[PDB]
């Protein structure tokens, strides 16, 4: 039977700490500098409390339902409170307990992205309800379908670190929220910087081992972020006449988001191109509305879609990628990327709508 | 002879950096948002300078006296300036130089906890004197008794990462201080977040290797912190009608502190329970006085005691723990936990009192 | 052929993230608290954009020219966009892709040191031009001469992590800048703290493996920083009557900088001595002018020179160092250290002057 490799154990535990750093305090500081001063304390409280909530639901049943073996949509309830997972149980080349924590840290950042933007306008009790509904019915199934051997994985979707699971998923949940409904830029810069650094655990850690794919994801992350910063800044200089700090940080997030599904499958040349496109598409995105912290979902959504589509192109050996699976044309992969994006957008939207309506019918959505 | 494992070397060096991050700037930012604005610069200076002081005393003689082989109370002076420790000397499965640094980082955070709270009211020269006295006569002996094969370890006390050595030890030193004698909440949140993230190096790193115990300590840390945030917040909502940012951060520290002695010995179920209890006991703790940054010692002390006692329960195989030693009943372990706590409280108190009185008799305690 | 060791891969990827953390947001926050409030946003934008620029130039041709095999001054253009570097290619004991990223992160911090100080007085377009010229003609050749088997390495210069490549190199580039031409101290402290923590990746990571040299560099880093904090603070107390936060942070950077070339070659005793000397020389340095963020180059330059010279002393086996190369007297090594420093100062100065003059002749240096 498979034995744990201590180097992979070490790597994956440090990567988990880096992903947790993205939420606490990464995303909290990012939104903290963006939202209105009088709402900062409240938002920091909601992000901290929902984070704690996600950590507990993850261990109680989330992990079991996302990663246990079940059907194409969800796992099982055989790993409740991690029951039946022996301490020395190995998953891949690391102890399963580490896989539990690494995966749980992705659920946290996903929920943090949503809560940080909406804390201002939503009642505390309504946010708790929403998180419970959406994590359970959207994050878990999509995580299972993509990384838990479910529907999307079974059709060969390529999503290295979560362009669908995390990015498009949360962007849609947030946009539905915004539909129903910067004071400190150094703070926004600091949150962006923390997100950037934690994103190396997020992207490289997604290899599940300290190998050449982790190395490739690492370098592609550095390259796409940089290329997206320049793309965004160039567009801003051309449209607005000068760059801005918010543009620079926005560009960084755009490349980070765009390279997320593609990092472990593409060559550096592809990372540079995905980065430039993500930086400009992000700028075009926010520009098309038509502001407030909800434009953040525009960037995550647009760049996530762009990243997911471009993964179906740049993964090709001919463009320096690791190569598509045997017997898979680029045309075929593209079609699977589009289908995965479509399923994600609709699954997340429906569940989000149900979550917001349930909260509204129970405690009232809008803050008192 | 034992050979160093590079994966453990890598893990332990990164964990040391994470523990150093807890002090610089973790604890400094935490207290910085809590104390009065006019005292921030001074406190940041005292924390930085005493930190430097601890780093030097550690290498000069601290490590030798804490970890050298001696008696039940202290080691020896054979490792002065790390003399006689060959560069390739292995301790456990890592180079001894790494053990020196990892252990020294625990001395730093312990002293930071005390200095950050008391900087406001104490004269600079008096704090330096106190640190010298208390690190040498309290931190070192207790570290030796618990982790250096001394008295407490010889009776089978369970303290994975320092509920006695760090937590109860510093809480008592601080409370004696307070006896003799929030302006920026985003800053308090940031310090809490940095402490949380560095605490994974602190807790998981305490395994001395990237194995399944490190994995277990990691997951228990995530779970207890989350459970303590919810416990504290629930109590606050029940007693005060609403949660607060300070309550959320306080809850986090309460679980972090409570899980400290227990993380490598308990199951996730036990971590969740210790977390809830620590969050409520922490709230009860500060509430019972009867405010200022010294309430911080109330949380570290109360939660440290609770953690240490509960370790003697939850370590049982029957409750999902790793199991007590052979021939040791739960009743026996509980008695040893109580004795360790009692010895710590008294040892730290006496030494602290001597330290404060010596400073007072030399330079004058209270700031001019 | 050489096979990658996963523990070294894990270590080096985490060390790269820590070095990237030094720039984003380390150096940006450090300068952010030092410069005038009205100039902060602009400086944060220039540091973010030039950082992105350096990341891209590094992958496009920087790495190839710095580390490819060429002559004594520069490498080659065989690794453009990392062409011809197989994904599984090993360099030392890690995948080459990791060496590319680790090395690129050093170029970033070097440029960040310069840009953060000069952003206030320089036109945005002029800074971009300057970075392009100076990275290509100064950073790259000096990196090649020292770490790329070039001129200096061929004569046995000792520079573990960059006293010449990074420190003296950027200090000179900045001083030429200043020649042609604190509002938030908690912010300066936070940036210093982040630089300190990231510096463990910088120094220990320079071993290229998680071995005993990485362990030694780690411990020497803790010791020299602490000793430099105390040295600086003692001098300040003696000259000014009391310590200050800025003095404490300055002392920390002085030891960090001074131990940079020496960390992997000296004993802890030597680290303590280099630390005290660097702290006092740094204080003497800034004092000798005759203020503004350009005094920062005084510290990096003076301490870098002191570190580089003292490396030629403390590396001796007799003083606890790892020992000079076979057949090399201390007198010989000292002469080689002086020659390396001299070449660096002149190479960087000339190139910097050319860079500033080219920018001035193209777009105008001084901000409009």
Swiss-Prot record, chains A, B, C:
<feature type="transmembrane region" description="Helical">
    <location>
        <begin position="124"/>
        <end position="148"/>
    </location>
</feature>
<feature type="binding site">
    <location>
        <position position="206"/>
    </location>
    <ligand>
        <name>NH4(+)</name>
    </ligand>
</feature>
<feature type="topological domain" description="Periplasmic">
    <location>
        <begin position="316"/>
        <end position="330"/>
    </location>
</feature>
<feature type="topological domain" description="Periplasmic">
    <location>
        <begin position="149"/>
        <end position="162"/>
    </location>
</feature>
<feature type="transmembrane region" description="Helical">
    <location>
        <begin position="187"/>
        <end position="206"/>
    </location>
</feature>
<feature type="topological domain" description="Cytoplasmic">
    <location>
        <begin position="32"/>
        <end position="42"/>
    </location>
</feature>
<keyword id="KW-0924">Ammonia transport</keyword>
<feature type="site" description="Important for optimum substrate conductance">
    <location>
        <position position="202"/>
    </location>
</feature>
<feature type="transmembrane region" description="Helical">
    <location>
        <begin position="10"/>
        <end position="31"/>
    </location>
</feature>
<feature type="transmembrane region" description="Helical">
    <location>
        <begin position="268"/>
        <end position="286"/>
    </location>
</feature>
<feature type="transmembrane region" description="Helical">
    <location>
        <begin position="97"/>
        <end position="119"/>
    </location>
</feature>
<keyword id="KW-0997">Cell inner membrane</keyword>
<feature type="transmembrane region" description="Helical">
    <location>
        <begin position="214"/>
        <end position="238"/>
    </location>
</feature>
<keyword id="KW-0812">Transmembrane</keyword>
<keyword id="KW-0813">Transport</keyword>
<dbReference type="GO" id="GO:0015670">
    <property type="term" value="P:carbon dioxide transport"/>
</dbReference>
<protein>
    <recommendedName>
        <fullName>Ammonium transporter AmtB</fullName>
    </recommendedName>
</protein>
<feature type="topological domain" description="Periplasmic">
    <location>
        <begin position="68"/>
        <end position="96"/>
    </location>
</feature>
<feature type="transmembrane region" description="Helical">
    <location>
        <begin position="245"/>
        <end position="265"/>
    </location>
</feature>
<dbReference type="Pfam" id="PF00909">
    <property type="entry name" value="Ammonium_transp"/>
</dbReference>
<dbReference type="GO" id="GO:0008519">
    <property type="term" value="F:ammonium channel activity"/>
</dbReference>
<feature type="topological domain" description="Cytoplasmic">
    <location>
        <begin position="120"/>
        <end position="123"/>
    </location>
</feature>
<keyword id="KW-1133">Transmembrane helix</keyword>
<feature type="transmembrane region" description="Helical">
    <location>
        <begin position="294"/>
        <end position="315"/>
    </location>
</feature>
<feature type="topological domain" description="Cytoplasmic">
    <location>
        <begin position="239"/>
        <end position="244"/>
    </location>
</feature>
<dbReference type="InterPro" id="IPR001905">
    <property type="entry name" value="Ammonium_transpt"/>
</dbReference>
<keyword id="KW-1003">Cell membrane</keyword>
<dbReference type="GO" id="GO:0042802">
    <property type="term" value="F:identical protein binding"/>
</dbReference>
<feature type="site" description="Important for the deprotonation of the ammonium cation">
    <location>
        <position position="159"/>
    </location>
</feature>
<keyword id="KW-0472">Membrane</keyword>
<comment type="similarity">
    <text>Belongs to the ammonia transporter channel (TC 1.A.11.2) family.</text>
</comment>
<dbReference type="InterPro" id="IPR029020">
    <property type="entry name" value="Ammonium/urea_transptr"/>
</dbReference>
<feature type="transmembrane region" description="Helical">
    <location>
        <begin position="331"/>
        <end position="359"/>
    </location>
</feature>
<comment type="subunit">
    <text>Homotrimer. In response to elevation of the extracellular ammonium concentration, interacts and forms a complex with GlnK. Interacts with GlnK with a stoichiometry of AmtB(3):GlnK(3). Sequestration of GlnK is reversible.</text>
</comment>
<dbReference type="GO" id="GO:0005886">
    <property type="term" value="C:plasma membrane"/>
</dbReference>
<feature type="topological domain" description="Periplasmic">
    <location>
        <begin position="207"/>
        <end position="213"/>
    </location>
</feature>
<dbReference type="GO" id="GO:0072488">
    <property type="term" value="P:ammonium transmembrane transport"/>
</dbReference>
<feature type="site" description="Twin-His motif. Important for optimum substrate conductance">
    <location>
        <position position="167"/>
    </location>
</feature>
<feature type="topological domain" description="Periplasmic">
    <location>
        <begin position="266"/>
        <end position="267"/>
    </location>
</feature>
<dbReference type="InterPro" id="IPR024041">
    <property type="entry name" value="NH4_transpt_AmtB-like_dom"/>
</dbReference>
<feature type="transmembrane region" description="Helical">
    <location>
        <begin position="163"/>
        <end position="178"/>
    </location>
</feature>
<feature type="transmembrane region" description="Helical">
    <location>
        <begin position="43"/>
        <end position="67"/>
    </location>
</feature>
């Amino acid at each position: 039977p498979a034995v744990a490799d201590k180097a992979d154990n070490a790597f994956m535990m440090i990567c988990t700490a880096l992903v947790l750093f993205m939420t606490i305090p990464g995303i909290a500081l990012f939104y903290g500098g963006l939202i209105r001063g009088k709402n900062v304390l409240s938002m920091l409280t909601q992000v901290t409390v929902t984070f704690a909530l996600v950590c507990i639901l993850w261990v109680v049943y989330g992990y079991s339902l996302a990663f246990g073996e079940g059907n194409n949509f969800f796992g099982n309830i055989n790993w409740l409170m991690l029951k039946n997972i022996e301490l020395t149980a190995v998953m891949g080349s690391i102890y399963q307990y580490i896989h539990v924590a690494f995966q749980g840290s992705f659920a946290c950042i996903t929920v943090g992205l949503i809560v940080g933007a909406l804390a201002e306008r939503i009642r505390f009790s309504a946010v708790l309800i929403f998180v419970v509904v959406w994590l359970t019915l959207s994050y878990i199934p999509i995580a299972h379908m993509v990384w838990g051997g479910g529907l999307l994985a079974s059709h060969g979707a390529l999503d290295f670190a979560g362009g669908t699971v995390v990015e498009i998923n949360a962007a849609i949940a947030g946009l539905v929220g915004a539909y129903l409904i910067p004071h400190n830029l150094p703070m926004v810069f600091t949150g962006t910087a923390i997100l950037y650094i934690g994103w190396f655990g997020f992207n490289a850690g997604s290899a599940g081992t300290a190998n050449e794919i982790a190395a490739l994801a690492f370098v592609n992350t550095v390259v796409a972020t940089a290329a997206a910063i320049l793309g965004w800044i160039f567009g801003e200089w051309a449209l607005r006449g000068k760059p801005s700090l918010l543009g620079a940080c926005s560009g960084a997030i755009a490349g980070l988001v765009g390279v997320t599904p593609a990092c472990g499958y593409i060559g550096v040349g592809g990372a540079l191109i995905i980065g430039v496109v993500a930086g400009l598409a992000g700028l075009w995105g926010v520009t098309m509305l038509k502001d407030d912290p909800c434009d953040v979902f525009g960037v995550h959504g647009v760049c996530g879609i762009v990243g997911c589509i471009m993964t179906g192109i740049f993964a090709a050996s001919s463009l320096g990628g690791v190569g598509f699976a045997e017997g898979v044309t680029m045309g075929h992969q593209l079609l699977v990327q589009l289908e995965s994006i479509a399923i994600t957008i609709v699954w997340s939207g429906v569940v989000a709508f149900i979550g917001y309506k349930l909260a509204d019918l129970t405690v009232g959505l809008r803050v008192p």
